């Protein structure tokens, strides 16, 4: 029944169509927009060029082979088609592994998200990766080092109409290791320590810390898409032909459709998402998460005028008093609006208050030093939000916290009047109190 063959042809055409579309879209954004000219994005690019070559040069011919039930392009393209196929898969993991190492030298430097690389140094490293990846992919195939010596391989090598990738047991293992597993586990190791040094230096609430998560998803899917293919490759090569070829060809196509997946993982970033939308016609950091940042005078939960990163302006209800205090604080006539530089110049000053105002407040200083650094900030947060007025005004939990009775301290603050007004920020800091960790930030 020819119903199946035309059904998959449509389904395969769209797969190729999706891959080429979403990756021309990605390459376009990073090139058009000057905001996106990061070294991290120069790697994003070649990652999309490797996906574009698959969409054009590799995937369609693998679709023709399945539907035509044979290879119609001769043995020259047959050895070229695969040497390109493996060039795109090796140049990728070698780039997804450079990202993870580049983001490691970024989170160990003052600006936690600044590459230590020049743009130019970033793009000779890219040239290198492609040169090296090509010479460890094209050379062993064009030089026939992959070739098997059993009779089936020999007969398929001789048919212009057969293009199976029969390989000698040494090449199958020495390639999977050097081209895949080695960069895989360097990546999975090095990047997992990028993730925890982020959560250490305070999850996934800061904007940039979600960018690191977005990269982790890229790697995360890439591994899961190409790993089943590469495991069954090793189990067959070592033992015997217990793997069918229709299961090997399906597990391979899972890594094939991966090329069309990155561009939509990128929609997680607000940066790419607004870029695509134009292309397509359409304690310091702890409080910054819990406070927010607004450049215009707004009203907090209790109705008080606030600006910046939760900076109280006045208890007075006359907006003119709020603007007058704000002008005195900033040193110019704001008319209710400030800049981000001014807003966190104030925020740096306002945090200094919340610590000195607890250095001097009755029995609420001993509880401060009774707790660790991760709970000190969880109380400086409560002060910052409510002063030493209210957080000193519920000694039931304060003693509970001093006595390290945290499972109890966390139930009391869940009934506190403060809990029912800001419930979500109430429990993120309650958990920071109970579990003594950054788990909620």
């Amino acid at each position, epitope marked *: 029944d020819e119903v199946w063959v035309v059904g998959m042809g449509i389904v395969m055409s769209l797969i190729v169509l999706a891959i080429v579309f979403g990756n021309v879209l990605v390459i376009t954004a990073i090139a058009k927009f*000057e*905001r*996106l*000219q*990061t*070294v*991290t*994005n120069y790697f*994003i690019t070649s990652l999309a060029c490797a996906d574009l070559v698959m969409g054009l040069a590799v995937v369609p011919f693998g679709a023709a082979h399945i539907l035509m039930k044979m290879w119609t392009f001769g043995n020259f393209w047959c050895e070229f088609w695969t040497s390109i196929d493996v060039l795109c898969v090796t140049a990728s993991i070698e780039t997804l592994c450079v990202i993870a190492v580049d*983001r490691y030298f*970024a989170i160990t*430097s*003052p*600006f936690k*998200y*600044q*590459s*230590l690389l*020049t*743009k*130019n140094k970033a793009r000779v490293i890219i040239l290198m990766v492609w040169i090296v990846s090509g010479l460890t992919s094209f050379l062993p195939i064009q030089m026939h080092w992959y070739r098997a010596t059993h009779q089936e391989a020999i007969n398929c090598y001789a048919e212009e109409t057969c293009c199976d990738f029969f390989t000698n047991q040494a090449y199958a293992i020495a390639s999977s290791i050097v081209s895949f597993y080695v960069p895989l586990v360097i990546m999975v190791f090095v990047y997992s320590r990028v993730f925890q040094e982020a959560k250490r230096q305070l999850k996934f609430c800061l904007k*940039e810390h979600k*960018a*690191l998560k*977005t*990269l982790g998803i890229i790697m995360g899917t890439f591994t899961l898409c190409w790993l089943p293919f590469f495991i069954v490759n090793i189990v067959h090569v070592i033992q015997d032909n217990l793997i069918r070829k229709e299961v090997y060809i399906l597990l391979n196509w899972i890594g094939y459709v991966n090329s069309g997946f990155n561009p939509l993982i990128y929609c997680r*970033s607000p*940066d*790419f998402r607004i870029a695509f939308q134009e292309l397509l016609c359409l304690i310091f950091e702890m409080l910054r998460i819990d406070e927010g940042l607004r450049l215009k005078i707004y009203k907090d939960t209790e109705g008080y005028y606030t600006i910046g990163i939760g900076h109280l302006l006045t208890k007075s209800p006359s907006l003119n008093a709020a603007k007058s205090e704000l002008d005195k604080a900033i040193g110019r006539n704001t008319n209710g609006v400030i*800049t981000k*530089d001014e807003a966190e*110049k104030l925020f740096n000053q306002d945090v200094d208050a919340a610590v000195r105002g607890i250095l001097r407040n009755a029995k609420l200083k001993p509880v401060y030093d009774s707790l660790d650094a991760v709970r000190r900030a969880a109380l400086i947060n409560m002060v910052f939000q409510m002063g030493e007025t209210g957080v000193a005004g519920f000694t039931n939990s304060l003693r509970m916290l001093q006595q390290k009775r945290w499972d109890e301290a966390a139930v009391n603050l869940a009934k506190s009047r403060w809990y029912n007004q800001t419930p979500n920020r109430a429990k993120r800091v309650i958990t920071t109190f109970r579990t003594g960790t950054w788990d909620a930030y």
Partner: nanobody
């Protein structure tokens, strides 16, 4: 990151002066830099930009009369305005661009004012 301007004075026309800007919180080596002015009744305007690699761009209205320059050792960027005209009078601000993961960020200093006296 934080920026710290210095160097604004009253100058007779045709005179000269230089502006300075210190920076902290990034690798000043890697950041692009430049100055912007804004005169009352006029919008903020780029005057001169020194990129991280060292390339320079100057506003046409001030071309050949201004030299942006940087010293990555002292974490500072300099602008030597010469041949000041009455039109150049504005408030000058220091800009540092610091790249992150997917995007580049802007940072400005508190500001300095220059006013040429007829």
């Amino acid at each position: 990151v934080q920026l710290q301007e210095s160097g604004g004075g009253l100058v007779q026309a045709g005179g000269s002066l230089r502006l300075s800007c210190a920076a902290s919180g990034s690798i000043f080596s890697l950041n692009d830099m430049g100055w912007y002015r804004q005169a009352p009744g006029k919008l903020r305007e780029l005057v001169a930009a020194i990129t991280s690699g060292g390339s320079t761009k100057y506003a046409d209205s001030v071309k050949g009369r201004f030299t942006i320059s940087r010293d990555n050792a002292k974490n500072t960027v300099y602008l030597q305005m010469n041949s000041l005209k009455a039109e150049d009078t504005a408030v000058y601000y220091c800009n540092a661009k610091v790249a992150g993961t997917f995007s580049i960020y802007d940072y400005w200093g508190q500001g300095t004012q220059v006013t040429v006296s007829s």
